[PDB]
């Protein structure tokens, strides 16, 4: 058989591969670079624009644009370059051969799916397509049918409660805190220690400081006192040029804004209170199964100690006879792709695809008809 | 094909030849001599003025003018004589036959290119012309696409950072220390030992003492103490008339003013600190590649030990995890010409020439439009 | 500054 | 987005 | 030059 593609556009990373594989063939940043300086040498083989690992490699010459932000595609001519690179250069497969599966954050604009569909059939000429809610796929990955899923990548965070494969749309919470807003906060706070980062090519440095050094405090105000009193907590990092920077009590302050969006001036409650309020909107027969199956998903949940901090601060809210368990598998950065990889391999699914014969009759609005 | 001429006017030397050659056909000093005494014999075949190797040969009778100083052409009626000599007498080729390529220091006055262009099309009637930044050609010569180039001839010194053939104009440093100001310093310092040199015809002697005897100290104040305490360092030179002079601790003091322009009363920092500051103006992603590819270029970098002194005193500034390499090929006095010789031979370049049909439409200002 | 720039 | 936020 | 230096 022709296996289908699974392509988790996400934001910030593209994850792609064939259904039935256990990890993606292609993981590269969803970033398009254009050169800003004057090219002076002649015969250099100048190239209009760079995608992914190239734009990361040459980033010092480039201006880097993400075409997707908050799970919304904001520039289609970039995004189509990213798909073109994914199919032809990175997977080295012609998409006209076999179906494609795409993933989207819930509750985002209706036109985004119509444009994705129109591009997939018109330019890439895919034989059939489907789009699937990421947080649903995270359950397929973690091997469950009853869950509440905190799925948090770059761009967007959302909670979806699912009971025995019935989703509860009225209870779906979406929040726009994400790895990119922890990064922009880490930029505005590192400045306290004099370090400075003003360009995209070094926003990509701060993005990797955040990944290695940052961690989540099990209780915030005592570690704030500790690392204000003893320097033993602070750690140091070599910038690309060889300068050494040092980061102390800061390296737990940026991921803790997930629990206090007030630090960046948002009104809304952190991931713990939005998780609890999402459970509270569910009807009371299912709350015990939701409290047991809290599933972490996506990369922004990778910070050390976010599991124990969640279990603590939800147990501070839950009724004390209940039992609260946070399921944080180590693969979890890929779980949306793994779930889509198994979903697309199910023989039952093969009916679900939007085929081109349907699209040519109904137009791109068919998605709202046949998808979720 | 008609090969193009490459004519690196420089200052002090003219280097000229055909594109695709590996060394210039013509290397002669860019010097015009006029006779100052009364000519007494009759029928001698007296001649108004001499160019190049003639004015060097007869220099005792002449006043010698350089028409170019600090990479600016200051007398066009001299310079056009020098070009006339280059094409017709030294290469023995009519410039109306095939294109010509010319080289210029960066950041010098805008009108210099307009005058060069106007003279090349109007009087010499060249079919096509181009002007190229010297420090760019030194990379073509040294076989690199990523570099920072310390290019230092007579007249002018400059640093140009180039990353993968993108130049970084905001980081271009230009400095007016040069072989001519080391020469005028060597004149004002030799007076310490009583020797005296007051005329151009013996400025041309001091210019050759500087070339043979001078060298750069790896650390200045210990060699200053050594050669003040032990005479073992001093060396002797025969003037043209047969007088012997002797030079001691002096012979390292004049080239060391490249590193301490205070000795001649300039404010600015030496070539090492201007190189480092030029790297610092570059963005932090590329600095490791700039630090690795430091390229020496031009004749004033020929002093023995200038490579090791540069590597020392930049390593004193660079972050200690970096690696610092100074690339000082032995040809380097010619590398700007070799680079222009390969540049002009590239088939891709043939579009780049300013053709006369373009110039006749746009006027001499077309250079700023179509050149770098 | 201490890193990103000269101050 | 189109109104509330910038995307 | 034209101002600062002599050329």
């Amino acid at each position: 058989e022709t296996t289908a593609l699974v392509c988790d556009n996400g934001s910030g990373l593209v994850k792609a591969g064939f259904a039935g594989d256990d990890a993606p063939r292609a993981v590269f940043p969803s970033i398009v670079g254009r050169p800003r300086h004057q090219g002076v040498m002649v015969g250099m083989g100048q190239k209009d624009s760079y995608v992914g690992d190239e734009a990361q490699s040459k980033r010092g010459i480039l201006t880097l644009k993400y075409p997707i932000e908050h799970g919304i595609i904001t520039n289609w001519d970039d995004m189509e370059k990213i798909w073109h690179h994914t199919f032809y250069n990175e997977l080295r497969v012609a998409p006209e051969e076999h179906p494609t599966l795409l993933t989207e954050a819930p509750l985002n604009p209706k036109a985004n799916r119509e444009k994705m569909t129109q591009i997939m059939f018109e330019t890439f000429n895919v034989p059939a397509m489907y789009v699937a809610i990421q947080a649903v796929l995270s359950l397929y990955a973690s091997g469950r049918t009853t869950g509440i899923v905190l799925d948090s990548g770059d761009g967007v965070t959302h909670n979806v409660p699912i009971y025995e494969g019935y989703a509860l749309p009225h209870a779906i919470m979406r929040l726009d805190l994400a790895g990119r807003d922890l990064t922009d906060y880490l930029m505005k706070i590192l400045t306290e220690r004099g370090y400075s980062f003003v360009t995209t090519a070094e926003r990509e440095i701060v993005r990797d400081i955040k990944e290695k050094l940052c961690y989540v405090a099990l209780d915030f105000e005592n570690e704030m006192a500790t690392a204000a009193s003893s320097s033993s907590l602070e750690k140091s990092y070599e910038l690309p040029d060889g300068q050494v920077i040092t980061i102390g009590n800061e390296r737990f302050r940026c991921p803790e804004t997930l629990f206090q969006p007030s630090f960046i001036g948002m009104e809304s409650a952190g991931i713990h209170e939005t998780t609890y309020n999402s459970i509270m909107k569910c009807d009371i027969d299912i709350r015990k199964d939701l409290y047991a199956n809290n599933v972490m998903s996506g990369g922004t949940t990778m910070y050390p100690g976010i599991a124990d901090r969640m279990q603590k601060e939800i147990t501070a809210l839950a009724p004390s006879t209940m039992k609260i368990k946070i399921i944080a598998p180590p693969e979890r950065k890929y779980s949306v792709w793994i779930g889509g990889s198994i979903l697309a391999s199910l023989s039952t699914f093969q009916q679900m695809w939007i085929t081109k014969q349907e699209y040519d009759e109904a137009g791109p609005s068919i998605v709202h008809r046949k998808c979720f | 094909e008609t090969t193009a001429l490459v004519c690196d006017n420089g200052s002090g030397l003219v280097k000229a030849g055909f594109a695709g050659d590996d060394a210039p056909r013509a290397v002669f000093p860019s010097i015009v001599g006029r006779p100052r005494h009364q000519g007494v014999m009759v029928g001698m075949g007296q001649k108004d003025s001499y160019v190049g190797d003639e004015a060097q040969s007869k220099r005792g009778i002449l006043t010698l003018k350089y028409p170019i100083e600090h990479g600016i052409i200051t007398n066009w009626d001299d310079m056009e004589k020098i070009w006339h000599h280059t094409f017709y007498n030294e290469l023995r080729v009519a410039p109306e036959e095939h294109p010509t390529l010319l080289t210029e220091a960066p950041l010098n006055p805008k009108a210099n290119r307009e005058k060069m262009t106007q003279i090349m099309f109007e009087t010499f009637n060249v079919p096509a012309m181009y002007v190229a930044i010297q420090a760019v050609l030194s990379l073509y010569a040294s076989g690199r696409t990523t570099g920072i180039v310390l290019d230092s001839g007579d007249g002018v010194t400059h640093n140009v950072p180039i990353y993968e053939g993108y130049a970084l104009p905001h980081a271009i440093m230009r400095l007016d220390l040069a072989g001519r100001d080391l020469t005028d310093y060597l004149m004002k310092i030799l007076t310490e030992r009583g020797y005296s040199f007051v005329t151009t015809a013996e400025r041309e002697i001091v210019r050759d003492i500087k070339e043979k005897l001078c060298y750069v100290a790896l650390d200045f104040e210990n060699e200053m103490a050594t050669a003040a305490s032990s005479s073992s360092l001093e060396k002797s030179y025969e003037l043209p008339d047969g007088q012997v002079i002797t030079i001691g601790n002096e012979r390292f003091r004049c080239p060391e003013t490249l590193f301490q322009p205070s000795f001649i009363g300039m404010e600015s920092a030496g070539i090492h600190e201007t190189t480092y500051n030029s790297i610092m103006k570059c963005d932090i992603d590329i600095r490791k590649d700039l630090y690795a590819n430091n390229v020496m270029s031009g004749g004033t970098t020929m002093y023995p030990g200038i490579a090791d002194r540069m590597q020392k005193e930049i390593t004193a500034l660079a972050p200690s995890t970096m690696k610092i390499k100074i690339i000082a090929p032995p040809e380097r006095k010619y590398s700007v010409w070799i680079g222009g010789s390969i540049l002009a031979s590239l088939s891709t370049f043939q579009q780049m020439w300013i053709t006369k049909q373009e110039y006749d439409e746009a006027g001499p200002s077309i250079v700023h439009r179509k050149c770098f | 500054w201490x890193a990103x720039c000269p101050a | 987005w189109x109104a509330x936020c910038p995307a | 030059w034209x101002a600062x230096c002599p050329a």
């Binding site: - | 590996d22 060394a23 032995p330 040809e331 | - | - | -």
Partner: protein
């Protein structure tokens, strides 16, 4: 060098360096291992192409006849 009757030190020097010369001056410049391998293989291709043209010239000498060729 034992086969070809050449000084070991000359081949060992010239394989790893190349000579630039202007009319006044000449420089012996080292070259990368890549350029050294390209140079060695270009020398082998040149020795071969010349040996081929020489064998073909001895063939022609054995095949020629003294009579003036009117046409062919």
């Amino acid at each position: 060098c034992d086969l070809m009757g050449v000084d070991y030190e000359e081949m060992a020097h010239w394989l790893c360096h190349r000579k630039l010369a202007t009319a006044t001056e000449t420089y012996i410049k080292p070259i990368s291992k890549l350029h050294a391998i390209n140079a060695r293989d270009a020398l082998a291709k040149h020795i071969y192409a010349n040996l081929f043209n020489w064998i073909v010239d001895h063939v022609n000498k054995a095949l020629h006849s003294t009579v003036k060729q009117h046409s062919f």
